[PDB]
Amino acid sequence: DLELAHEKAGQQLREAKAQAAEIVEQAKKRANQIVDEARDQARTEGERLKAQ
């Protein structure tokens, strides 16, 4: 049971590393989307060359 507990701890540890990597990966993907939408808003805001 002690040997099996060390093997289980080895799985729980690496699964937590993988999930933490995916949580930060999705955050970086979300951050990239926010800045690109902000670039399109700032590019569209240029309507002032004619709307004004």
Partner 1 sequence: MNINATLIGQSVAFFIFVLFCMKFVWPPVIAALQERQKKIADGLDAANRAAR
Residue ranges that bind partner 1, judged by CB under 8 A: 1-2, 5-6
DSSP secondary structure code for residue 15 in this structure: H
Which whole-number Å values give the CA distances from 45 to 6, 20, 30, 34, 50, in the listed order? 59, 38, 22, 16, 11
Q: Which two tokens stand for residue 17?
A: 């590393």
**Minimum distance between the CB of residue 6 and partner 1, rounded to whole angstroms?**
8
**Minimum distance between the CB of residue 14 and partner 1, rounded to whole angstroms?**
19
**Minimum distance between the CB of residue 8 and partner 1, rounded to whole angstroms?**
10
- Of 7 and 47, the one with the shorter C-beta distance to partner 1 is 7
